[PDB]
């Protein structure tokens, strides 16, 4: 029963929106876990196998 007659636009109801209650969710509880399985997966994956073949080339850099 929250009054407020006719007219009624809610008003301030961004306390009720993605503002603080989501982003704050963690932060420092939640982010060392998705990072962790990312880490594993986001670059000890490749991302390699070129640097390395990237001092040998064999060559000169070039292939006109």
Same mark, same amino acid.
């Given at each position: ?11 301030? $109801? ?6 603080? &209650? ?6 420092? $509880? +939640?982010?060392?876990?998705? &990072?962790? +399985?990312?880490?594993? +997966? ?7 196998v +070129? ?8 060559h000169?850099?070039?292939h006109?």
């Amino acid at each position: 029963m929250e009054e407020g007659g006719d007219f009624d636009n809610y008003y301030g $109801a961004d306390n009720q929106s993605e503002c603080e &209650y989501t982003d704050w969710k963690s932060s420092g $509880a +939640l982010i060392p876990a998705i &990072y962790m +399985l990312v880490f594993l +997966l986001g670059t000890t994956g490749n991302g390699l196998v +070129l640097w390395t073949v990237f001092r040998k080339k064999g060559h000169h850099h070039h292939h006109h």
